[PDB]
Design a protein around this ligand. Structure first.
Ligand SMILES: [C][C]([N])C(=O)N1[C][C]([C]/[C]=[C]/[B+]([O])([O])[O])[C@]([N])(C([O])=O)[C]1
Ligand SMILES: [C][C]([N])C(=O)N1[C][C]([C]/[C]=[C]/[B+]([O])([O])[O])[C@]([N])(C([O])=O)[C]1
Ligand SMILES: [C][C]([N])C(=O)N1[C][C]([C]/[C]=[C]/[B+]([O])([O])[O])[C@]([N])(C([O])=O)[C]1
Ligand SMILES: [Mn+2]
Ligand SMILES: [Mn+2]
Ligand SMILES: [Mn+2]
Ligand SMILES: [Mn+2]
Ligand SMILES: [Mn+2]
Ligand SMILES: [Mn+2]
Ligand code: NA
Ligand code: NA
Ligand code: NA
Lengths: 318, 318, 318
């Protein structure tokens, strides 16, 4: 009934944006934690659109050092289609990753219906390498380069990506959580003047001021739909250890919930990605449940679960 | 000699406000950690009034779903008597819990001598369910409902509680640490306009501003005695794991000491409860000592132990 | 090439300022973690001046209760000589401890070349006991007393220390991280009016304001060289467990990097001590690497490694 609680869940069991198998189980483990039931418990109208079937593309030799380009491009193409569908149905898209390369699809699909969207990107990483600046060749470290209009002429024709039209400007994204930024990425960040709150900023200002500044920046001029792309490695590995590229000194669990509580309260969340949960990379069973529980907690905050408490519009003293 | 260092210790080895055995050992384990000796070491005049003898009340069938009502009511009745005695003797009452239902007794007894008291309630929970809104039936989740004048006509005649007169108004309490609030409790909170700093607030503002706001709110108008009711589950379970209702994302150890340092420095601490330590619920021996050491640290801050250091009024360079 | 990236590394494998063997391995373990290579990777001109050879002084009976005075005095004498040499060569002195008594040498040597230096002292402890106020007799808890001009007439003639001339005034030092301060030390702190940010202050103000205040205080009047004496026990034992005098409730890893990032950005870092790493005191191998990695991270921040990222002056998009 509430627009900020009307939800379309898409599972994206995809791993070929990076080397480690296991991230493709993210949707399964999140679902098995009761994600859908818990969403319903807090007065959300929840439709599960299922897990996308990503066809194996067996012939997918690298483009220069960029790995699995056709698989990664196609998986994002399919996802873009599905996110657009969900958005046309009037729902907030909830993408369960899967590796972060999929943001190319998620944001693209979203932007088809709401071209005015603004992006909040929570991550240890900027994920803004181009196919030419990357040294790893892993496409989960490149999705932002593909989306940004200002970088149009710097992205080569990579097989699998001819469908992509960049759909956001440098001014339309804010990073929170940065702490492992490659030199080329830092060059891009400073050159394009992208708004960011690295861990230094968070330390300096506190998460309160960070969120105030993030939302004034994105929404001050006029209201418009928010796309939150949440990489669980933005949180410290003491909260989300079961992930492929952990970096120490991250955002706390509290900081994670603050971010998402504040976004929820704007009323403008329109797209959400919960990315990079890799249950195979927990050192123990408890590391897996710790990671998955944290991801579920972050997601529930996005759709209105508040630490101060929640109540329905009735008189509980009657 | 100093009024903020003149202390009356009461042990309240009581568990029937909740289901888990073990909380009744809180006083023993706190004492065995050297609590009394450590208090004396920092220039406190310490009187130990012993552990109250709580008579078994074998016939105590539930009142509707409310469990052990007569035991819980009687234990608080006895405690109220003892706290009043300590207060009449000019001492700061230090109640060693025991489960949080005992706050009914502690605050009631305190209020007999100082009816103008203000309460600071540190906890993951609001503990403000009535006998009618509770879904657990555990009376440690209800003490605030019994104390609040505004809820007088909403508390049924529960066996064991006919001695209770509500002694505080909605304006006379501040919550810090909230992060697991039942819908009915949230309704009560918003309806009565009670001042609270949930973890969201703490994240937003920082503990510094939280304490400034808490003390201006309670003491701005005029000075008056402070009652700090400290549930160790207000701190994150990484600091106080040995407790019955842990909730992740709590106040840090530093935040715990900041709160209590600031209260100590008002000069107005008059009543203290150190509640819900349950040594039986540590997963390991180290979890027990970690919990107990944290509780002792919090208590020592309340009576003047400062992280910057302390010295006696002499010339140490002579 | 850059003055804030021009470095002279001195190893100070010395332990006799305190009781626990193992701190003398600090330089070895830090070096084995790739400290020198990592410094070079971020465009630093790095000269390794080697580990100082500290001659055993077998006849070194205590001066009253002060232990190993001649060894401690001589080790600092040698270090002062070496730091002065490095400073004359135009380099930032990087001292790898070793116990904190060595700061007597490091700061003394530094002050020979730059008598206007200001000191930032990061530590759980004030390390300002005199030979007469100390109750432990360990000289790593006394270096600041030896350096401070205002305490000249309160330091007895301790064997090994006749070479010392106090070289800083009470106004020339700022403490960050304090949480275990002896009564005599607190007396000295308040008497001399030394600027400090205990953990209470950090909690109150946030590390952002702390660093702003620290740098305005030291540098507002005029620019001058900074000496950062970093005791790894200033960080919480959850980050730097392998150390001789851990104290819970310390500065976070993030807070550690914030401090050092901000100092680096002044352009005025002139002297650095990385002290009290004791690999023998890790409970496990992982506690050792955790400690050493944290120390290396802190050091790299001091010479320009930034969480937001770093890039060379080129066009990475070409
Ligand atoms: C292994 C490599 N040193 C790394 O940590 N990086 C990881 C990072 C990409 C991280 C992707 B993410 O989705 O986890 O944010 C990176 N910038 C890249 O492009 O591969 C480099
Ligand atoms: C088990 C239950 N889901 C719970 O966590 N709660 C625990 C909480 C009461 C906590 C009492 B305390 O003293 O630990 O704060 C509660 N509101 C109640 O009334 O039982 C509900
Ligand atoms: C063992 C003793 N209770 C202690 O913790 N202290 C340790 C502290 C000295 C710490 C030296 B440091 O370099 O670790 O900061 C101290 N002030 C002293 O003078 O010995 C007392
Ligand atoms: Mn990412
Ligand atoms: Mn990442
Ligand atoms: Mn409670
Ligand atoms: Mn509680
Ligand atoms: Mn020290
Ligand atoms: Mn120290
Ligand atoms: Na990731
Ligand atoms: Na509790
Ligand atoms: Na130390």
């Amino acid at each position: 009934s509430a627009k900020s609680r009307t939800i379309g869940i898409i599972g994206a069991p995809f791993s070929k944006g990076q080397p480690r198998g296991g991230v493709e189980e993210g949707p399964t483990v999140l679902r098995k934690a009761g994600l859908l039931e818990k969403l319903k418990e807090q007065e959300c109208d929840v439709k599960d659109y299922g897990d996308l079937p990503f066809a194996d593309i067996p012939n997918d030799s690298p483009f220069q050092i960029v790995k699995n380009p056709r698989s990664v491009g196609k998986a994002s193409e399919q996802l873009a289609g599905k996110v657009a569908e969900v958005k046309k149905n009037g729902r907030i898209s909830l993408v369960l990753g899967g590796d972060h390369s999929l943001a190319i699809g998620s944001i693209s699909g979203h932007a088809r219906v709401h071209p005015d969207l603004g992006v909040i990107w929570v991550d240890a990483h900027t994920d803004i390498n181009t196919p030419l600046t990357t040294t790893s060749g892993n496409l989960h470290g490149q999705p932002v380069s593909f989306l940004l209009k200002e970088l149009k002429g710097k992205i080569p024709d990579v097989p699998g990506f001819s469908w992509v039209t960049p759909c956001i400007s440098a001014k339309d994204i804010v990073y929170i959580g940065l702490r492992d930024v490659d030199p080329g990425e830092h060059y891009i960040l400073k050159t394009l003047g992208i708004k960011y709150f690295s861990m230094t900023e968070v330390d300096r200002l506190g998460i309160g001021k960070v969120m105030e500044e993030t939302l004034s920046y994105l929404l001050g001029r006029k209201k418009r739909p928010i796309h939150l792309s949440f990489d669980v490695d933005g949180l410290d590995p003491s909260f989300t250890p079961a992930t492929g590229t952990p970096v120490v000194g991250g955002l706390t669990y509290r900081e994670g919930l603050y971010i998402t509580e504040e976004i929820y309260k704007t009323g403008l969340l329109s797209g959400l990605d919960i990315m990079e949960v890799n249950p195979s990379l927990g050192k123990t069973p408890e590391e897996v449940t710790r990671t998955v529980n944290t991801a579920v907690a972050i997601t529930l905050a996005c759709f209105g679960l508040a630490r101060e408490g929640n109540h329905k519009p009735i008189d509980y003293l009657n």
